[PDB]
Design a protein around this ligand. Structure first.
Ligand code: NGS
Ligand code: CA
Length: 494
């Protein structure tokens, strides 16, 4: 029969926290086994570095300007539009979705779905059944999503149709609540700060004006768990709501671990660089405790597929809705076109008939997933899709007409973290960014000389011709993808 697809996508995972990409921080042996028996994309990006927009780009193969899902705060996905799950059903597939959806409208084009409301919760999450009833799933969401994915494959799947299963995790979303079994891990880990952790944002006004600084914005109580009745913070009430979901046993285990860390913190006088360093270590540790459950649960899926003899005829994909700042530029979160958040990890275990192993370097984006899946399914690829099937790359081809540039557009401002709206072009060599709301500011980076984007070159006479050439190339992409911002900054959402 046609190939199956198992697509696993996390929330705010990132290459820096996957050992197949980066060995500074975290071991991810189960994620690494997907890449090891397949390929890893070294130049993998998103079109709009935010969860809902990324999820709309994923299912449509289109930039936000065409799918109309611009942000997490003002949009409801019009599910009448073309999506790859519906096209796969029309090609004889069954389709299934578990976990985070984050498109506001109910999933369509799925034979089975069971999702969280909005962002979901780590402990004792509510879910929404396919009848739009709310149910309680007691336990820890990374385990529960996996349980339901495997239950669907084992007991619900029609054995007479090929399938596409989407497994959409809440891990590793803020505020990084570990499962009971992992509470104690990584306390023996202390990391060097990133070289640009104390970035002064010279030449970069949108970098200066964000509210996603570990030092300044990360919340001692909500993010770093330092709750005590005599302490207050902006997000203390939200913190108490989220850990308030825990039952007595879950909270007792939580407190057994955190109570000593709380006591040790409040005994100290910490400020400035010493406090920023303390916050970074706690952030990294809690993030990594949260990754551990995710890696183990991806292992469960991998081991199940292997035992059932499904891997030979199944593409296994692992990615994140976007990358994430692990202290680069002093940040957490995403949103910017800057490299760490424009990038997203992408690894695939390749089925029988694809011998390629190792690294793929051609520039790929989340708008490419839909046409890839349709081609692998033997389904027609509609011309209105913006992305390009990656199947030639999986086959070891280097197409002469492969793209030389990617487009990007981020829209969610004013909003949480206060990242200005911006669009831009990224080539193999350069990135040109236009921040357009609520400032008018261009930036140019030489990604070869300056891969950490510390030196805005825009306005230097020796880069005038490069900047003008990139504007011409970017306008051609805006024409290709029909982004009306090319006409006026006020026409960014038409
Ligand atoms: C207080 C709090 O947790 N705020 C987070 C933000 O840091 C995050 O930026 C936003 C969007 O993330 S997204 O859904 O991954 O795009 O989700 C909120 O839940
Ligand atoms: Ca996310």
């Amino acid at each position: 029969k046609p190939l199956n697809i198992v697509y696993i996508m996390t929330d705010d995972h990132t290459a820096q926290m996957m050992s197949c990409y980066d060995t500074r921080y975290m071991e991810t042996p189960n994620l690494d086994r997907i890449a090891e028996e397949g390929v890893l994309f070294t130049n993998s990006f998103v079109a709009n570095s935010l969860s809902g927009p990324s999820r709309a780009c994923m299912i449509t193969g289109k930039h936000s300007c065409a799918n109309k899902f611009y942000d997490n705060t003002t949009c409801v996905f019009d599910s009448a539009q073309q999506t790859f799950p519906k096209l796969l059903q029309k090609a004889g597939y069954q389709t299934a979705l578990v976990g985070k959806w984050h498109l506001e409208s109910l999933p369509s084009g799925f034979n089975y779905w069971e999702i969280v409301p909005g962002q979901g919760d780590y402990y004792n999450p509510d879910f929404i059944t396919q009848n739009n009833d709310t149910i309680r799933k007691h336990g820890y969401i990374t385990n529960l999503i996996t349980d339901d994915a495997i239950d669907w494959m084992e007991h619900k799947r029609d054995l007479d149709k090929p399938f596409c299963l989407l497994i959409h995790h809440k891990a590793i979303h803020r505020n990084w609540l570990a499962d009971t079994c992992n509470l104690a891990l990584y306390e023996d880990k202390t990391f060097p700060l990133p070289d640009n952790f104390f970035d002064d944002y010279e030449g970069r006004p949108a970098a200066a004006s964000q509210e996603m600084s570990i030092a300044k914005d990360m919340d001692m109580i909500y993010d770093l768990k330092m709750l005590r009745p005599d302490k207050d913070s902006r997000l203390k009430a939200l913190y108490e709501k989220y850990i308030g979901r825990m039952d007595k046993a879950q909270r007792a285990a939580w407190d057994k671990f955190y109570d000593p860390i709380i006591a040790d913190f409040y005994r100290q006088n910490l400020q400035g660089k010493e406090l920023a360093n303390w916050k970074f270590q706690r952030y990294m540790r809690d993030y990594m405790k949260t990754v551990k459950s995710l890696d183990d649960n991806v292992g469960r899926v991998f081991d199940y597929l292997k035992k059932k003899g499904l891997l030979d005829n199944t593409l296994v994909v692992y990615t994140s809705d976007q990358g994430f700042y692990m202290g680069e530029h002093g940040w957490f979160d995403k949103r910017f076109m800057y490299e760490e958040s424009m990038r997203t990890p992408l690894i695939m275990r390749l089925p029988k008939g694809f011998d390629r192993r190792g690294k793929i370097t051609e520039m790929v984006q989340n708008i490419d997933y839909a046409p890839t899946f349709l081609e692998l399914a033997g389904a027609p690829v509609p011309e209105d899709i913006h992305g390009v099937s990656l199947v030639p790359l999986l086959k070891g081809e280097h197409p002469q007409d492969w793209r030389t540039a990617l487009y990007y557009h981020f829209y969610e401002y004013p909003a949480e973290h206060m990242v200005k709206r911006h669009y831009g072009i990224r080539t193999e060599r350069y990135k040109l960014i236009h921040f357009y709301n609520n400032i008018n500011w261009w930036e140019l980076y030489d990604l070869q000389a300056d891969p950490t984007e510390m030196h805005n070159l825009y306005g230097q006479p020796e880069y005038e011709s490069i900047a003008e050439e990139l504007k011409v190339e970017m306008e051609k992409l805006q024409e290709q993808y029909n982004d009306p911002v090319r006409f006026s900054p006020e026409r960014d959402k038409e």
